[PDB]
Amino acid sequence: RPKVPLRTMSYKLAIDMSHFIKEKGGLEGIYYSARRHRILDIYLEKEEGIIPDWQDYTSGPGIRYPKTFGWLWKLVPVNVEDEEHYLMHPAQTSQWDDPWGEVLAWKFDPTLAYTYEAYVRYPEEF
Amino acid sequence: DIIVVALYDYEGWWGDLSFQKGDQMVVLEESGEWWKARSLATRKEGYIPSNYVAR
Questions:
Q1: Which run of H or of E encompasses A42?
Q2: Considering A65, A111, B20, B34, which has the largest number of Cβ atoms within 10 A of its Cβ?
Q3: Within a 10 A sphere around the Cβ of A104, how many other Cβ atoms?
Q4: Which residues from A are below 8 Å from B46, CB to CB?
Q5: What is the CATH topology of the domain spanning B1-55?
Q6: A15: closest chain B residue by CA
Q7: Is the C-alpha dihedral spanning A70, A30, A6, B20 positive or negative?
Q8: Residue A43: which residues within 8 A CB-CB, separation 6 or more?
Q9: How many angstroms away from the CA of A97 is the closest CA of chain B?
């Protein structure tokens, strides 16, 4: 089977794929990091032809909501490293990737198929 | 009435038309590399990868 042509992520793709990933036991509870964000981007690009322009989240401290409606994986802060360790070793926590220094974890939330929380809460970020 | 035939099986996502090799279907829109199609087997509509089919 050849690779499918690239495409943007529609909200239907977002909902279908989020549930599929959820069902197959991915992402839930895993620590968020810039690297893992990119790994996710790359996996779906080279496996579903998804252009990596869909994975964006809201900024302020606390829960980060996906800015692509239909994507059901938000970032939840975890309650829990010095900068030099961050540079020289691949620490996989968002402590230093995150502008607000919170450690974030992926959480599945299906109400994100019902409410575009990012848009309704943080319009300025669009 | 452009009709294509599947050259490989395709298990798609919501909004795609899934098909198996040999299935024949009408192209409803042929713009770009993702096409709109209706399956002759089911009358089901959805999007398909153009590189999976041929006239």
A1: helix A34-48
A2: A65
A3: 23
A4: none
A5: SH3 type barrels. (2.30.30)
A6: B14
A7: negative
A8: none
A9: 32
Range of the domain at A74: 1-126
Give the list of residues 6+ apart from residue A84 with CB closer than 8 angstroms, or none: none
State whether residue A115 is helix, strand or coil.
Answer: coil
Within 10 angstroms of residue A81's Cβ, the number of other Cβ atoms is 12
Radius of gyration, CA atoms only, chain B:
9
User: Chain B residues with CB inside 8 Å of A16's CB?
Assistant: 13-15
Give me the total of CB pairs closer than 8 Å, taking one residue from chain A and one from chain B.
Answer: 35
Please give the biggest Cα pair distance in chain B. 25
If one counts every other C-beta atom within 10 angstroms of the C-beta of residue A120, the result is 9
Q: Which residues of chain A are within 8 Å of residue B32 when distances are taken between CB atoms?
A: 5
Structure tokens at B18: 């899934």
**Residue among A9, B7, B45, A48 nearest B36 (CA):** B45
Domain harbouring A36, CATH code: 3.30.62.10
Technique behind this structure?
A: X-ray
Q: How many domains does chain A have?
A: 1
Residue B6's DSSP bridge partners are B53
B→A contacts (Cβ < 8 Å), by residue, are 8-10, 13-15, 32-34, 49-52
